[PDB]
Design an enzyme around this catalytic site. Structure first.
Site, PDB file in Angstrom:
ATOM      1  N   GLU A  44       0.892  -1.002  -0.030  1.00  0.00           N
ATOM      2  CA  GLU A  44       0.007   0.025   0.098  1.00  0.00           C
ATOM      3  C   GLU A  44       0.832   1.241  -0.131  1.00  0.00           C
ATOM      4  O   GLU A  44       1.754   1.256   0.880  1.00  0.00           O
ATOM      5  CB  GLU A  44      -1.060  -0.104   1.213  1.00  0.00           C
ATOM      6  N   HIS A 466     -17.774   7.900  -6.741  1.00  0.00           N
ATOM      7  CA  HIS A 466     -18.122   6.813  -7.091  1.00  0.00           C
ATOM      8  C   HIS A 466     -17.749   6.205  -8.438  1.00  0.00           C
ATOM      9  O   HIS A 466     -18.174   5.777  -9.245  1.00  0.00           O
ATOM     10  CB  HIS A 466     -19.667   6.320  -6.941  1.00  0.00           C
TER      11      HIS A 466
HETATM   12  C1  LIG Z   1     -13.387   9.164  -1.924  1.00  0.00           C
HETATM   13  C2  LIG Z   1     -14.438   8.865  -1.533  1.00  0.00           C
HETATM   14  C3  LIG Z   1     -15.495   7.626  -2.087  1.00  0.00           C
HETATM   15  C4  LIG Z   1     -16.622   7.393  -1.260  1.00  0.00           C
HETATM   16  C5  LIG Z   1     -17.281   8.112  -0.307  1.00  0.00           C
HETATM   17  C6  LIG Z   1     -16.639   9.250  -0.382  1.00  0.00           C
HETATM   18  C7  LIG Z   1     -15.283   9.767  -0.830  1.00  0.00           C
HETATM   19  C8  LIG Z   1     -14.774  11.100  -0.299  1.00  0.00           C
HETATM   20  N1  LIG Z   1     -18.560   7.874   0.131  1.00  0.00           N
HETATM   21  C9  LIG Z   1     -19.027   6.746   0.169  1.00  0.00           C
HETATM   22  C10 LIG Z   1     -18.489   5.803  -0.785  1.00  0.00           C
HETATM   23  N2  LIG Z   1     -18.985   4.661  -0.966  1.00  0.00           N
HETATM   24  C11 LIG Z   1     -19.932   4.032  -0.451  1.00  0.00           C
HETATM   25  O1  LIG Z   1     -20.311   2.936  -0.807  1.00  0.00           O
HETATM   26  N3  LIG Z   1     -20.498   4.959   0.723  1.00  0.00           N
HETATM   27  C12 LIG Z   1     -19.883   6.140   1.014  1.00  0.00           C
HETATM   28  O2  LIG Z   1     -20.531   6.965   1.923  1.00  0.00           O
HETATM   29  N4  LIG Z   1     -17.088   6.112  -1.532  1.00  0.00           N
HETATM   30  C13 LIG Z   1     -16.821   5.112  -2.773  1.00  0.00           C
HETATM   31  C14 LIG Z   1     -16.028   3.947  -2.213  1.00  0.00           C
HETATM   32  O3  LIG Z   1     -15.152   4.359  -0.839  1.00  0.00           O
HETATM   33  C15 LIG Z   1     -15.019   3.672  -3.465  1.00  0.00           C
HETATM   34  O4  LIG Z   1     -15.787   3.278  -4.328  1.00  0.00           O
HETATM   35  C16 LIG Z   1     -14.430   2.458  -2.916  1.00  0.00           C
HETATM   36  O5  LIG Z   1     -13.761   2.632  -1.734  1.00  0.00           O
HETATM   37  C17 LIG Z   1     -13.078   1.871  -3.860  1.00  0.00           C
HETATM   38  O6  LIG Z   1     -12.486   0.801  -3.556  1.00  0.00           O
HETATM   39  P1  LIG Z   1     -11.293   0.302  -4.284  1.00  0.00           P
HETATM   40  O7  LIG Z   1     -12.104   0.015  -5.620  1.00  0.00           O
HETATM   41  O8  LIG Z   1     -10.963  -1.029  -3.560  1.00  0.00           O
HETATM   42  O9  LIG Z   1     -10.305   1.323  -4.244  1.00  0.00           O
HETATM   43  P2  LIG Z   1      -9.536   1.961  -3.101  1.00  0.00           P
HETATM   44  O10 LIG Z   1      -9.090   3.358  -3.502  1.00  0.00           O
HETATM   45  O11 LIG Z   1     -10.343   1.743  -1.923  1.00  0.00           O
HETATM   46  O12 LIG Z   1      -8.251   1.108  -2.903  1.00  0.00           O
HETATM   47  C18 LIG Z   1      -7.143   1.494  -3.917  1.00  0.00           C
HETATM   48  C19 LIG Z   1      -5.686   1.698  -2.588  1.00  0.00           C
HETATM   49  O13 LIG Z   1      -4.690   1.309  -3.507  1.00  0.00           O
HETATM   50  C20 LIG Z   1      -3.430   2.276  -3.297  1.00  0.00           C
HETATM   51  N5  LIG Z   1      -3.015   2.488  -4.367  1.00  0.00           N
HETATM   52  C21 LIG Z   1      -3.232   3.439  -5.530  1.00  0.00           C
HETATM   53  N6  LIG Z   1      -2.051   3.291  -6.503  1.00  0.00           N
HETATM   54  C22 LIG Z   1      -1.214   2.403  -5.693  1.00  0.00           C
HETATM   55  C23 LIG Z   1       0.060   2.396  -6.235  1.00  0.00           C
HETATM   56  N7  LIG Z   1       0.663   2.676  -7.369  1.00  0.00           N
HETATM   57  N8  LIG Z   1       0.744   1.410  -5.486  1.00  0.00           N
HETATM   58  C24 LIG Z   1       0.414   1.188  -4.126  1.00  0.00           C
HETATM   59  N9  LIG Z   1      -1.002   1.439  -3.741  1.00  0.00           N
HETATM   60  C25 LIG Z   1      -1.721   2.173  -4.484  1.00  0.00           C
HETATM   61  C26 LIG Z   1      -4.439   3.572  -2.495  1.00  0.00           C
HETATM   62  O14 LIG Z   1      -3.593   4.378  -1.785  1.00  0.00           O
HETATM   63  C27 LIG Z   1      -5.470   3.024  -2.107  1.00  0.00           C
HETATM   64  O15 LIG Z   1      -5.230   2.532  -0.567  1.00  0.00           O
END
Ligand SMILES: *Cc1cc2c(cc1C)Nc1c([nH]c(=O)[nH]c1=O)N2C[C@H](O)[C@H](O)[C@H](O)COP(=O)(O)OP(=O)(O)OC[C@H]1O[C@@H](n2cnc3c(N)ncnc32)[C@H](O)[C@@H]1O
EC number: 1.1.3.17
Length: 530
Positions: A44, A466
């Site tokens: 992460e 989203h």
């Molecule tokens: C940002 C956002 C999104 C949601 C709400 C609000 C806000 C500000 N509110 C919300 C949401 N959904 C709900 O169902 N109810 C709510 O009240 N939001 C959406 C939901 O939160 C997102 O759609 C969902 O988490 C997406 O999940 P995911 O597809 O697993 O993606 P993540 O961003 O959770 O995880 C990605 C992860 O990987 C890391 N990362 C990114 N790039 C890299 C690289 N290059 N190397 C290593 N790691 C990386 C990111 O830091 C992140 O932790």
């Protein structure tokens, strides 16, 4: 173990590597680690969330936007929308489950059955999802008169207490307007109804994020290694096109370090970063790869395509009395309603916010207030489609994110959004709200015709946050679907994707719980394949 300094890691080879410890990734990694004969690494880019109160205390979430916990992706200039809009994305353990408002929804069974029946994703339907939602949750509504619900899952869902008197009055006003109180997450889709949400939050105020729920309890587990502060820049492949690991960079000098996976790599870096990481690794639309000098490993025209979202408008009001000073997460009620007859899913959803929301209205001269409330309509099945593209061959450059808001050729998204504004005003004007609703601050009562409301939306809209579907699953023979129904990246082996980028079509509701369900399913696909 938790490793925040790669120099401390001696064995850099694992059975599985999950890249991105977000909503889906933490799930996949936790669930893979349940086999003690297997070694799992979760990589992460952001920091550990343990002991960061701004992340853990749900009621502080609005402060995370544009902080050091936000990758902060502004969008490309918009043909028919708001060029100032920013896609906030969390950069911390838990991902966006660590920054969001914790609104918790099972997806409509009609959304999920379509993945298989309409979009070719063999095996993806409500039957497959239903037991996974139950497994993932401990739900306050669990019991014998609601046997679909889980009572033992790591993700705690709870009912928002109906303490906010403006929200109680708003629901009374919905009823007066033909929108009844409805129970959420019963397994039956709410087409016309409203209520206080379920939220994935623990009793003590801590968000029930993917990291809190799946990862904090197993950090010391023997076969599990957590690596934070490390950013994947490229996936590594064999001469046979077997993915054998990931190159990661540390935050100290930006040296590159290779991690090796014996079985599979799981990409879970989300709908914006996953397409970018695959493109950097030579997997993506050939002509786009060539414009940045990148050798094509797989010509996968669908990578970065089909970007979908819940675009969001706003109607803000002055309150006639003092608004609440405390809240679970400030956005406690949802209202679903159809703008058309014959729908099995609402085409419009609105959030009610006990605060003004003037992020996009102030720059256009709309008056604001310190005491008011917002209604934010969103288009549940937006027909616009955008892209995520490389800005350059340099992994440090943010990608170009172009959702193309309000460009669907039939003008659907914009039509629903205008109706949502009119409906928000109709609700706020009901007798039950008469001692709350003051002056409409935006768009304001001078905005009445379809043209005025369209011009307002184009200027001031936001997003529900989203984004989905940029690395979609689909039929084995569909060239535009970069993944097969088993989440394997076509054209290479040893590599899967599990996060919001896989959805072939957005779901009607807030997608977080669904994205964790996608994590749970990917882990099962992996376990059954071996
Ligand atoms: C940002 C956002 C999104 C949601 C709400 C609000 C806000 C500000 N509110 C919300 C949401 N959904 C709900 O169902 N109810 C709510 O009240 N939001 C959406 C939901 O939160 C997102 O759609 C969902 O988490 C997406 O999940 P995911 O597809 O697993 O993606 P993540 O961003 O959770 O995880 C990605 C992860 O990987 C890391 N990362 C990114 N790039 C890299 C690289 N290059 N190397 C290593 N790691 C990386 C990111 O830091 C992140 O932790």
């Amino acid at each position: 173990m938790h490793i925040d300094n790669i120099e401390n890691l001696s064995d850099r080879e694992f059975d599985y590597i999950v890249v991105g410890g977000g909503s889906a990734g933490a799930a996949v990694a936790a669930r893979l680690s349940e086999d003690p004969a297997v070694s799992v690494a979760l990589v992460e880019a952001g920091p550990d969330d343990r002991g960061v109160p701004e992340v853990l205390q749900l009621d502080r979430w609005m402060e995370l936007l544009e902080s050091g916990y936000d990758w902060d992706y502004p969008i490309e200039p918009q043909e028919n929308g708001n060029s100032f809009m920013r896609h906030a994305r969390a950069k911390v353990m838990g991902g966006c489950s660590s920054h969001n408002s914790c609104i918790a929804f099972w997806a409509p069974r009609e959304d999920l059955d379509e993945w298989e029946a309409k979009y070719g994703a063999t095996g993806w339907n409500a039957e497959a999802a239903w037991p996974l939602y139950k497994r993932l949750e401990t739900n306050e509504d669990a019991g014998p008169d609601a046997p679909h619900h889980g009572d033992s899952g790591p993700v705690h869902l709870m009912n928002v207490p109906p303490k906010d008197p403006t929200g109680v009055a708003l629901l009374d006003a919905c009823e007066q307007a033909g929108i009844p109180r409805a129970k959420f997450n019963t397994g039956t889709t709410v087409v016309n109804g409203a209520n206080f949400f379920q939220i994935n939050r623990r009793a003590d105020g801590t968000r029930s994020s993917s990291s809190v729920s799946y990862i904090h309890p197993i950090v010391e587990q023997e076969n599990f290694t957590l690596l934070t502060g490390l950013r994947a820049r490229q996936l590594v492949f064999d001469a046979d096109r077997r993915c054998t690991g990931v190159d990661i960079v540390d935050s100290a000098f930006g040296h590159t370090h290779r991690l090796t996976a014996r079985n599979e790599v799981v990409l879970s870096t989300g709908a914006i970063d996953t397409p970018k990481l695959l493109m950097l690794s030579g997997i993506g639309p050939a002509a786009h790869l060539a414009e940045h000098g990148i050798e094509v490993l797989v010509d996968s025209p669908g990578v970065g395509e089909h970007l979908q979202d819940h675009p969001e408008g706003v109607v803000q009001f002055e309150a006639k009395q003092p608004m609440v000073a405390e809240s679970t997460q400030w956005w406690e009620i949802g209202i679903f309603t159809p703008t058309e007859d014959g729908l099995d899913r609402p085409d419009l959803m609105m959030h009610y916010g006990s605060v003004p929301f003037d992020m996009n209205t102030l720059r256009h001269g709309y008056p604001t207030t310190e005491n008011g409330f917002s209604l934010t309509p969103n288009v549940t099945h937006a027909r616009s489609r955008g892209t995520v593209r490389l800005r350059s061959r340099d992994f440090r450059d943010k990608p170009m994110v172009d959702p193309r808001y309000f460009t669907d050729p039939e003008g659907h998204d914009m039509r629903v959004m205008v109706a949502g504004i009119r409906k928000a005003r109709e609700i706020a004007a009901q007798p039950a709200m008469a001692e709350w609703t003051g002056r409409e601050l935006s768009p304001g009562v001078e905005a009445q015709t379809d043209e005025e409301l369209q011009d307002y939306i184009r200027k001031t809209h936001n997003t529900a946050y989203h984004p989905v579907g940029t690395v979609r699953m689909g039929a084995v023979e569909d060239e535009m679907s970069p993944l097969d129904p088993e989440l394997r990246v076509k054209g290479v082996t040893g590599l899967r994707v599990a996060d919001a980028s896989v959805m072939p079509e957005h779901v009607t509701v807030n997608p977080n719980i669904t994205v964790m369900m996608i994590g749970e399913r990917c882990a099962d696909l992996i376990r059954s394949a071996r």
